[PDB]
Amino acid sequence: LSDRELEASLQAFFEVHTRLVHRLAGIEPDPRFEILDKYIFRQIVADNPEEREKIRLDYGRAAEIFRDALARDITTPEAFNAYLEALGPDAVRTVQDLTRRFVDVIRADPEAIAKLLNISKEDVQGLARAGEAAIERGEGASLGVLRELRKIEKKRN
């Protein structure tokens, strides 16, 4: 019913989304990815309220796709892409739309994300840049964003 209840009901998505992306990257979980993921979802549904059930079911559909990807231990974008293409055009479109909204939210409100994560506006634009570049390479935006988050954290020390 409410936005927070939508996000909670999608708990399985955020779990399989962060686990799949970190499997692709081959690294230990960075909790800040799932924080970002959840904020981005909250923003999409708050900005597109007339569309919230469509957004909800797309994430729920993405959850199954990602879950099945993990069950096969997909570890590269290429293997994931072939799996997704075998699933069919609707599975492709579901993930592509989810990815595209992901980067677009980061790029459209970098100040809010920079506060959320206590990083700079430049850093958040760097995340959007890395997401676009991964989309360009066929990698999906979440993986570029995760890698760039790890790079930003490298500057702590």
- The number of beta carbons lying within 10 Å of the beta carbon of residue 100 is 15
State the SS3 of 57-88: HHHHHHHHHHHHHHHCCCCCHHHHHHHHHHHC
Tokens linked to 137: 């390479």
Q: Is residue 60 a contact partner of residue 10, using CB atoms and an 8 Å limit?
A: yes
Q: Which region, left, alpha or beta, applies to residue 138 given φ > 0 means left and ψ of -120 to 50 means alpha?
A: left
**How do the domains of the chain map onto residue ranges?**
3-154
Tokens linked to 68: 């099945």
- The number of beta carbons lying within 10 Å of the beta carbon of residue 122 is 10
Closest-CA residue to 97 (of 48, 134, 59):
59
Q: Is residue 109 a contact partner of residue 134, using CB atoms and an 8 Å limit?
A: no
- Kindly tell me the burial class for residue 136, based on how many C-beta atoms sit within 10 Å of its own C-beta (0-12, 13-18, 19 or more): exposed
Q: Is residue 116 a contact partner of residue 33, using CB atoms and an 8 Å limit?
A: no
Instruction: Give me the torsion for CA of 28, 30, 35, 36, rounded to 10°.
Output: -110
- The number of beta carbons lying within 10 Å of the beta carbon of residue 157 is 4
Tokens linked to 30: 């960075």
Segment holding 50, helix H or strand E: none
d(CA 140, CA 138): 6
As a whole number of Å, the end-to-end CA separation of the chain is 43
Largest CA distance in the chain: 45
Method used experimentally:
X-ray
Q: Which residues contact residue 65 at a Cβ distance below 8 angstroms, ignoring those fewer than 6 apart?
A: 84, 87, 91, 94, 95
Q: Which residues contact residue 144 at a Cβ distance below 8 angstroms, ignoring those fewer than 6 apart?
A: 130, 131, 132, 133, 134, 135
Closest-CA residue to 97 (of 140, 156, 43, 157):
140
Angstrom resolution of this structure:
2.1
